[PDB]
Design a protein around this ligand. Structure first.
Ligand code: SF4
Ligand code: SF4
Ligand code: SF4
Ligand code: SF4
Ligand code: SF4
Ligand code: SF4
Ligand code: SF4
Ligand code: FES
Ligand SMILES: [Ca+2]
Lengths: 905, 145, 166, 147, 565
């Protein structure tokens, strides 16, 4: 297509509208109601341009560029006089009722309405009458509501309802009294409600957790990082001020998590600011905890380790690839253990083997939205991999997109698409132990134990391909529903099979692999997705090592006297009594961690590791994508006594002091080169980010905006002398504003979006090749493995049907977005949001045991009687008991385990 | 003899109070970013009624060039430059003036302005609709069309 | 009060504070506002921006001065570097020579310099120094800071003149 | 939602095109007569209160520009109009035409205001009786006296 | 068509002359808001283009400026040749009353230009500063050494990859520099300073001049400058357009608002702001008050603290500060004039005539001062033009060139005042006479300012006026929004280049601003007259005595902060 804007000629896409085409060309058109992910509706009337019929047309006509297709030979004018006056008048009409609130507004300096008011040139008020006002609502602990600042752009309701599928937000009232909010006071129920603080162009919806410790955007120190709260690997921009983590902003990645986070990643950063975090190396002596600096801690640990006969290491999926590799080099490959349980490790390696040996392509998170049928087996994705659930919702709405495309309706005209596709949707079949949050759009939901879900998967695979093993004992109703699933999956152009390790069953993963193989054998374009548990679960699986049970056995027999535990609390993956006994028997326990854990009471040495905000490293995605996260701030900049080093720095210095009796800390690129040298499967982490010598025309990449304030006052209460700027030898970023953050800079890692005239999250438009697409020079992060040429064989181990045994209760896992993750549940803002720990009972089982709802029952697991109140679960199959994994006292390793002596307290 | 100073004289910086007696500063951080030297540092805190205020407010007067850009950028007329020049010290750390060294007992050069009488954000003593040029809030459940 | 490392001691303190021979070293635009060899001088008034090239000159002329020596820094430049946090400017003259009295301002008034002279005389009169070198330790008083001494009268200020007058 | 016409337009046929060239619309063809006892400012005020309170709230010009015209017409009704009010009304009629708003409710809203300003302008000018002001005097700050 | 409109100046006769001489495909015309034809010349044609401009019928006789620009970070280079670096040459034709800016593009791997010192002798210090701050080599330069930074400095500060902030202070480097200064006379090399008899080192500002003496006669001299270098241009790349104003104050500290005027006029050209008449009169009045203060100080130092005190009292009444007001704003001034300013100005203008007559009696008719000052180290129009001399010296050579009349700015065309010119000889006495007559004319301008002062706004009605008027900021939400974004992120200047040249207290001061579309200046170039006046010293006192050099140093109006910026 060819368009002529203001006399200049441009080549654009004809399938795009004029607003997105002109924004992709660098032209500035003000807009409110349009969003790249939400489509065009024509509400705010801000994007007005003057369209002419041909080249010899002088009158023209004002049209909305978001509602006008960028067809071939289209003549428009942005800088036309009448269009400029109309856009200024739209800004003025919005300004008539807007409150005098900018100094006490959390959106100030980050506000799209401020930027568009300045951009249109409106600065003079001639409206003299009263402004309408509104009462606010309580929206829960995360989102603060200020209804006075609304411009009625309908972005919130469109995102929350049409995109995110939420039900408790809406627009109420009439003409100029339109109210956007909930029908009553209460917490927003959506798992993706936190994206409202960037979707809303004004300060109506603000980050309440940030509002507690508010600072402006220009005062922030940003870094490009990876969210640590599950395996999905969403790109984030942590922003700090005065030595504490203050906000998590969405960092655009056109391949992974483009505009949207989930609420866990956005609001579960509060564990970084906990005051009980270790900040110095601490050595115990008798009952005295003496504080050491880094050098003498390294020397004492090196001599004590050298006096030992065998040192073993226990890694964690919390830690990065570099930290786990440094531990593996410190103790040796034969003495390195992964730190997760044996069954968890087996499920993780099975998922990994399906990913890089199953011969079936695994899609990225953005690519999930293009699949025409989804089968989810055992993985409650909303509570474990929430952004995958959001992408599955988009893939489900793909059917309405298809029927609209058949009627020659443009893909950005979202209201017409939704009107054509009323309730027709792509097939979604979710299986779980109970009801999921995806059941509102699912074509079918299967509530059954994990062996029954695996049997359903194997039956689907056998009905798709007769070479797959069959399942004996299928009821005709279940057989008919299996036939419905098979007819839906066979007729799909792009079927997608999603599973994961959170179900706690190996056979569910095997059944999902068999379904994917059966769909691959029919020539379909089948994709497979595996949801891991933690941020670097797949990297720990790729690196490998022994299980936690083997390390505990080595400590308990006495073959190992020294144990180094890296970023692992050890109670989520093993029984607490066994861990306590093994660590009390061990004469030397060293714990390298950034959070106060229960195993630090028995620790001889505690090394204060850095969290993700204070460390660099690489983490491996659930789809096998290596992604580098960068340090946000120096923890020793304000508190000079703080010795909080990177975990790989601690372990490399420990290995150097053990070998040559001298301290060499490290550089990060040296550890990365060591990883790609000793481990060839992790050789792709070299290309995840450029090294520390990378420059943009000779200068580093800036971590803070150019108007960063208080450079001679922020530390003045400690010392009037300004300290040295912290040096970053690890990465290409500088801990200052003396750097580059140009949107045209040839790089992939962007710490924050800012452009002149665009101070809001709409500044991400300038950093993309086309708006809503990819980053201009490619998205960061590379895939570790490609699709294998040949797949796996059919798994013939079909599990038997679930049989309830008397006195034994099979534990059905119930994951929660707020609580099941360890670090996020340590955050103080998650304590109010997470619920009380209930235990789920079938009505028949509760009636047999004589307990109603809310009554406390006590059960013994591993010789430990704990009591929980009973919640009646209708969908849970009898013979099962429901437990919330990841909570305090209920380890995620309990999923799939049995349970004895369920007695009323 | 005492030295005469004009009322516009750019001397010692103070934080002033509203006519109701509350401190005028809403901790909006405009003065800190407008400072070319970067010698203002402050943090926003919020009271129980929702009123924004500075948790701390420090000015490095060993760095301050007394240019008055912070007073120019203040949207509440809190920070002001007053006719006073006797500010010499013995130690440079003593030129770091905290909030208790700046907050005077009166309105200073602007005797009547109150920012919170203009802002729509509700605080104690001013609910929604009681600010200047504001109508009462109309519920969407009201019977009037 | 605290000291950081007898009638005639008061006499020498009185004579030293009541006759100060200054050496005004004017680096920059503080020099015009404030308007003897260093071997015959005892007070160094450093007024102006401390450049990297002229910092050895300041250090040499301070080293040529004879004991006892006091230093008064005028203006934000000599105090901390002022507005010039830049590659060619030393951030404060106290980076390399000790300073007795600091004056804020850019530029300060001459009466501010006279008030700092009062402060210097008070600090001289409240100090104990080795009388004859035949304890050879200089004891400087930890004086109460001026901002806490004058805090009550400063905070008690309520109304000021409006800026619409001359 | 139709433009006002005068007594000189009483002789044209009730057709779509004939009333189209006259500057109005045939509409529902149910005409309404306005006698000399009716203040045109009051009548247009009543019309604009109806049109402003019947807005659906979807799009900015109707939703946030019809109440501005209502408040201006109330000020003209009370004799509290200020200079620039009629210019603001004319700008509102220009910027609420077809294509500028999401639907045709606001062009129909601004048709009678346009025609009444065009014909009976003297009553609207008679509504203005006080000087323009939307700034209080802040003590200690000299205003920027624009010319 | 306002005065800030983007123009290519294709109708300038110099463009047609260059097209006829060199061909239509030899240069590229750039459209700017500098008011100047900007012509991109190939590097190999630079010397012949300059020689052609030197031999025009109304030739370009003065090299006004010469410096560099790092174009590597510049994103809006549409209509420009491919350049990693560039060197610009600002040339002035006084007879034509015109000017031209030649620009040479340079690749990063080949940073060398032919020297301009054969065509214009004042290009020596400009090329030395360009080599010092950008690393651009000039082939054929006699002594291409650093002039702002010391000779042991590493890197080039004005490059975009050089960090602007102050580094960590090291006592070891201080002791090394002090030991180098102590043994500077012991290990002095005459060839290292550009020379080829006794050598003297000695220290308007403390600057060191190395002197070669035949017994007592000055044979050669090279001054060591850069001791007052504050990095003001690099700070121009680090401050927003609004927050850079006090830095403009501290360039020529006796000028104050005179120094603020060209910067705010150039920013207003970038912003497309036409200020109202009252802003023009207020700026002219403050500029003339500061010009009177500077001229009084110069005359008194040549021969006092009371008229300057009255000037400072009036300036302190208006702006709240005496010497560094920082009162000018983008689009106007910071506040309105306080009520009672007219009575203060009336009392100032009644005290001044008899004092001015007293200065005339004490300076012009002083026979001993006339004998001491007349004919000692003088120069003519040819030496003034070839060295970039402006202000009192250039007009003392007889060339009637004042910016307030030749290229009027800030409404100076609405005032009635004369421009005094001397004979053909520019010595101390003629310059003092010219400054006394300029004092009288500035008093005339102040009287005209007082007599009919316009009533109106003190700030423009533009959205980019920074900051907005305070009462509307405190009352109106859109004005509050504009103020919020202007004081925090900064006003957004659309990408362009602007230039403003004004008549400062010591000559011609100019600001050349390059905006890359951001809220910070991409390039701020300050041309100061004292740099050019100090460069021409060795060409004027060659063969004189040291006392003659002292008298000549006191006779030229210069300050080292203005020299080194
Ligand atoms: S939403 Fe934006 S324009 Fe409105 S008060 Fe907040 S910062 Fe100001
Ligand atoms: S609350 Fe925010 S997103 Fe929703 S309509 Fe109002 S301004 Fe738009
Ligand atoms: S889906 Fe996972 S990786 Fe993404 S924001 Fe949520 S917790 Fe973080
Ligand atoms: S007067 Fe200027 S230098 Fe001092 S604190 Fe205010 S803005 Fe900063
Ligand atoms: S600009 Fe004023 S209200 Fe805002 S933080 Fe500074 S002193 Fe407080
Ligand atoms: S403190 Fe201010 S007046 Fe003094 S030398 Fe520095 S810039 Fe000049
Ligand atoms: S013009 Fe139509 S779409 Fe727009 S708000 Fe009015 S009634 Fe709704
Ligand atoms: S962005 Fe086009 S009308 Fe809202
Ligand atoms: Ca690091």
């Amino acid at each position: 297509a060819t368009i002529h804007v203001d006399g200049k000629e441009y080549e654009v896409n004809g399938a795009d509208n004029l607003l997105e085409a002109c924004l992709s060309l660098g032209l500035d058109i003000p807009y409110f109601c349009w969003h790249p992910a939400l489509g065009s509706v024509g509400a705010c009337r801000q994007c007005a341009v003057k369209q002419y019929q041909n080249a010899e047309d002088t009158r023209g006509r004002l049209v909305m560029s978001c509602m006008t297709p960028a067809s071939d030979g289209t003549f428009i004018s942005i800088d036309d006089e009448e269009a400029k006056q109309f856009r200024e008048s739209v800004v003025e009409w919005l300004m008539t009722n807007h409150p005098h609130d900018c100094p006490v507004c959390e959106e100030g300096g980050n506000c799209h309405l401020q930027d568009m008011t300045v951009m249109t040139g409106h600065s003079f008020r001639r409206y003299r009458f009263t402004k309408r006002t509104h009462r606010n609502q309580d929206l829960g602990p995360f989102i603060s509501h200020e209804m006075n600042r609304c411009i009625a752009c309908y972005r919130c309701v469109r995102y929350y309802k049409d995109y995110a599928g939420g039900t408790d937000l809406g627009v109420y009232g009439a003409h100029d009294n339109v109210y956007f909010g909930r029908p009553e006071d209460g917490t927003l129920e959506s798992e993706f409600s936190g994206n409202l603080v960037e979707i809303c162009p004004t300060g109506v919806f603000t980050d309440k957790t940030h509002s507690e410790r508010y600072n402006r955007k220009w005062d922030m120190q940003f870094a490009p990082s990876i969210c640590q709260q599950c395996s999905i690997g969403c790109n984030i921009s942590p922003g700090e001020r005065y030595g504490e983590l203050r906000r998590i902003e969405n960092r655009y990645n056109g391949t992974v998590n483009h505009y949207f986070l989930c609420d866990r990643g956005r609001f579960g950063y509060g564990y970084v600011n906990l005051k009980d975090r270790p900040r110095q190396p601490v050595q115990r002596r008798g009952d005295d905890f003496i504080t050491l600096n880094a050098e003498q801690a390294m020397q004492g640990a090196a001599d004590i380790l050298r006096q030992s006969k065998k040192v073993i290491g226990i890694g964690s999926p919390r830690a990065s690839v570099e930290s786990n590799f440094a531990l593996r080099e410190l103790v040796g490959e034969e003495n390195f253990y992964t730190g997760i349980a044996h069954g968890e490790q087996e499920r993780l390696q099975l998922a990994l083997k399906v990913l890089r040996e199953g011969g079936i392509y695994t899609p990225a998170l953005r690519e999930i939205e293009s699949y025409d049928a989804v089968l989810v087996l055992g993985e409650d994705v909303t509570q474990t991999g929430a952004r995958v659930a959001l992408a599955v919702r988009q893939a489900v709405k793909g059917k309405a997109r298809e029927m609209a495309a058949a009627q020659k309706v443009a893909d950005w005209q979202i209201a017409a698409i939704l009107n054509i596709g009323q309730r027709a949707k792509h097939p979604l079949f979710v299986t779980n132990v109970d009801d999921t949050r995806l059941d509102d759009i699912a074509a079918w939901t299967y509530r059954a134990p994990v062996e029954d879900q695996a049997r359903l998967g194997f039956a689907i695979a056998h009905a798709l391909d007769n070479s797959a093993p069959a399942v004996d004992g299928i009821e005709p109703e279940l057989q008919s529903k299996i036939d419905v699933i098979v007819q839906a999956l066979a007729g799909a152009k792009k079927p997608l099979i999603i599973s994961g390790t959170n179900a706690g069953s190996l056979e569910v993963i095997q059944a999902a692999a068999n379904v994917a193989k059966a769909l691959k054998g029919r020539g379909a374009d089948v994709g497979i997705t595996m949801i891991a548990r933690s941020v670097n679960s797949m990297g720990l699986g790729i690196m490998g090592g022994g299980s936690l049970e083997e390390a505990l056995t080595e400590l308990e027999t006495g073959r190992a006297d020294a144990v180094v535990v890296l970023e692992n609390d050890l109670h989520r993956h093993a029984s607490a009594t066994r861990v306590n006994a093994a660590l009390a028997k061990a004469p030397l326990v060293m714990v390298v961690d950034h959070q106060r854990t229960a195993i630090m009471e028995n620790a001889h040495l505690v090394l204060s590791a850095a969290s993700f905000a204070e460390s660099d490293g690489t983490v491996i995605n659930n789809e096998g994508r290596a992604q580098r996260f960068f340090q946000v701030y120096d923890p020793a900049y304000y508190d000079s006594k703080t010795v909080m080093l990177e975990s790989w720095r601690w372990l490399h210095s420990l290995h150097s002091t053990l070998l040559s009796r001298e301290v060499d800390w490290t550089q990060l690129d040296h550890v990365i080169d060591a990883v790609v040298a000793k481990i060839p499967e992790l050789a792709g982490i070299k290309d995840a980010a450029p090294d520390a010598t990378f420059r943009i025309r000779g200068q580093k990449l800036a971590r803070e905006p150019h108007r960063y304030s208080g450079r001679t006052a922020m530390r003045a209460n400690i010392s009037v002398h300004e300290p040295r700027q912290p040096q970053d030898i690890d990465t290409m970023f500088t801990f200052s504003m003396e750097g580059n953050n140009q949107p045209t800079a040839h790089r992939s890692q962007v710490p924050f979006a800012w452009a002149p005239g665009w101070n809001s999250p709409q500044a991400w438009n300038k950093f993309q090749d086309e708006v809503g697409g990819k980053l201009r020079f490619g998205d960061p992060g590379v895939r570790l493995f490609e699709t294998s040429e040949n797949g796996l064989d059919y798994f013939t181990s079909v599990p038997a049907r679930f049989q309830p045994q008397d006195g034994k209760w099979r534990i059905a896992p119930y994951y929660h977005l707020f609580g099941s993750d360890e670090l996020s549940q340590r955050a103080p803002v998650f304590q109010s949001r997470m619920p009380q720990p209930y235990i789920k009972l079938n009505p028949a089982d509760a009636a047999k045991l004589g307990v109603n709802a809310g009554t406390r029952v006590s059960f013994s697991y591993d010789g430990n009687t704990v009591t929980l109140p009973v919640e009646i679960a209708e969908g849970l199959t009898a013979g099962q008991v429901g437990l919330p994994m990841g909570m305090s006292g209920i380890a995620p390793v309990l999923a799939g385990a049995h349970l004895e002596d369920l007695k009323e307290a | 003899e005492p030295v005469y100073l004009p009322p516009r004289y750019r001397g010692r910086i103070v934080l002033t109070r509203d006519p109701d007696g509350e401190e005028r500063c809403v901790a909006c951080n405009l003065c800190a970013v407008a400072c070319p030297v970067g010698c203002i540092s402050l943090q926003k805190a919020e009271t129980k009624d929702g009123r924004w205020y500075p948790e701390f407010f420090r000015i490095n007067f060993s760095r301050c060039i007394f240019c008055g850009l912070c007073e120019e950028a203040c949207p509440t007329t809190a920070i002001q430059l007053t006719p006073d020049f006797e500010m010499g010290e013995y130690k440079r750390q003593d030129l770091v003036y905290e909030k208790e060294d700046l907050l005077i007992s009166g309105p200073g050069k602007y005797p009547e302005y109150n920012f919170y009488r203009m802002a729509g954000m509700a605080i104690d003593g001013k609910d929604k609709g009681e600010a200047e040029n504001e109508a009462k809030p109309i519920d969407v459940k009201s019977l009037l069309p | 009060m605290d000291y950081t490392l007898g009638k005639l001691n008061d006499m020498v303190n009185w004579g030293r504070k009541n006759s100060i021979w200054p050496y005004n070293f004017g680096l920059s635009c503080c020099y015009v506002e404030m308007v003897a060899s260093p071997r015959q001088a005892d007070l160094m008034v450093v007024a102006g921006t401390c450049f990297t090239k002229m910092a050895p000159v300041i250090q040499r002329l301070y080293d040529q001065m004879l004991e006892p020596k006091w230093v008064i820094s005028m203006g934000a430049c000599a105090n901390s570097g002022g507005m010039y946090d830049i590659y060619s400017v030393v951030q404060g003259v106290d980076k390399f020579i000790p300073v007795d009295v600091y004056i804020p301002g850019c530029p300060p008034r001459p009466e501010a310099y006279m008030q700092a002279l009062m402060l210097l005389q008070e600090s001289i009169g409240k100090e104990r120094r080795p009388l004859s070198w035949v304890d050879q330790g200089v004891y400087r008083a930890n004086m109460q800071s001026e901002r806490e001494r004058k805090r009550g009268e400063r905070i008690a200020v309520t109304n000021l003149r409006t800026p619409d007058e001359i | 939602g139709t433009d006002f016409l005068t007594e000189a337009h009483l002789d044209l046929p009730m057709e779509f095109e004939s009333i189209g060239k006259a500057g109005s619309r045939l509409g529902t063809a149910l005409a309404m007569a306005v006698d000399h006892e009716i203040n045109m400012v009051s009548l247009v005020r009543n019309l604009e209160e109806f049109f402003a309170r019947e807005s659906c709230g979807w799009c900015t010009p109707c939703r946030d520009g019809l109440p501005w015209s209502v408040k201006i017409l109330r000020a003209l009704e009370r004799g509290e109009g200020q200079p620039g009010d009629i210019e603001t009304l004319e700008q509102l009629c220009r910027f609420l035409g077809p294509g500028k708003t999401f639907c045709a409710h606001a062009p129909g809203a601004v048709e009678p205001l346009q025609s009444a300003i065009k014909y009976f302008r003297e009553e609207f000018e008679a509504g203005i009786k006080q000087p323009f002001s939307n700034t209080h005097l802040i003590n200690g700050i000299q205003p920027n006296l624009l010319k | 068509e306002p005065a800030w409109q983007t123009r290519d100046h294709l109708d300038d006769p110099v463009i047609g002359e260059l097209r006829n001489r060199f061909g239509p495909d030899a240069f590229t015309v750039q459209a700017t808001r500098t008011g100047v034809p900007v012509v991109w010349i190939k590097r190999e044609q630079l010397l012949e283009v300059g020689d052609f401009l030197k031999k025009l019928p109304k030739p370009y006789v003065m090299l006004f400026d010469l410096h560099g620009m790092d174009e590597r970070l510049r994103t809006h280079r549409e209509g420009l040749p491919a350049a990693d670096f560039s060197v610009f040459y600002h040339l002035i034709s006084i007879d034509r009353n015109r000017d031209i800016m030649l620009k040479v593009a340079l690749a990063e791997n080949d940073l060398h230009v032919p020297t301009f010192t054969k065509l214009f002798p004042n290009a020596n210090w400009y090329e030395r500063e360009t080599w010092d701050l950008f690393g651009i080599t000039f082939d054929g330069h006699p002594n291409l050494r650093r002039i702002m930074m010391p000779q042991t400095w590493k890197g080039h500060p004005l490059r975009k990859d050089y960090p602007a902030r102050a580094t960590e202070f090291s006592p070891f480097e201080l002791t090394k520099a002090k030991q180098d200064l102590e043994m500077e006379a012991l290990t002095f090399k005459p060839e290292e300073w550009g020379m080829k008899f006794m050598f003297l080192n000695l220290g308007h500002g403390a600057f060191r001049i190395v002197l070669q003496l035949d017994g007592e006669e000055i044979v050669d001299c090279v001054p060591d400058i850069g001791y007052h270098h504050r990095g003001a241009e690099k700070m121009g790349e680090r401050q927003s357009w609004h927050s850079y104003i006090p830095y403009t104050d501290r360039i020529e500290y006796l000028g104050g608002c005179v120094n603020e005027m060209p910067y705010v006029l150039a920013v207003e050209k970038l912003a497309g702001i036409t200020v109202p008449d009252r802003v023009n009169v207020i700026r002219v009045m403050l500029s003339e008050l500061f010009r009177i203060n500077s001229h009084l100080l110069y005359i008194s130092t040549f021969i006092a603290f009371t008229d300057r005190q009255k000037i400072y009292d009036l300036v302190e009444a208006i702006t709240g500060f005496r010497m560094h007001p920082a009162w000018f704003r983008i689009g106007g001034v910071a506040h309105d004039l306080p009520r009672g300013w007219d009575r203060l100005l009336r009392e100032f203008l009644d005290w001044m005539p008899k004092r001015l007559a007293s200065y005339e009696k004490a300076a012009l008719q002083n026979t001993i001062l006339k004998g001491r000052s007349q004919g000692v180290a003088a120069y003519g129009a040819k030496e003034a033009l070839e060295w970039g001399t402006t202000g009192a010296g250039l007009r003392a050579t007889g060339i009637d060139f004042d910016v307030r009349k030749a290229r009027p700015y800030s409404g100076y065309e609405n005032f009635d005042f004369e421009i005094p010119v001397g004979g053909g000889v520019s010595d101390c006495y003629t310059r003092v006479m010219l400054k006394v007559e300029e004092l009288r004319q500035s008093l005339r301008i102040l009287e005209q300012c007082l007599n009919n002062m316009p009533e109106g706004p003190f700030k423009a009605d533009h959205p980019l006026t920074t900051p907005p008027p305070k009462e509307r900021t405190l009352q109106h939400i859109e004005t509050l929004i504009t103020h919020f974004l202007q004081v925090s992120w900064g006003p957004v200047m659309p990408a362009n280049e602007s230039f403003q040249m004004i008549e400062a207290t010591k000559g011609i001061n100019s600001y050349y601003l390059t905006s890359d579309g951001s809220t910070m200046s991409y390039r701020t170039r300050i041309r100061t007259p004292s740099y050019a006046h100090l460069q021409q010293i060795p060409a004027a006192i060659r063969g004189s005595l040291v006392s003659d050099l002292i008298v000549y140093l006191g006779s030229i109006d210069f300050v080292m902060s203005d020299v080194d910026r």
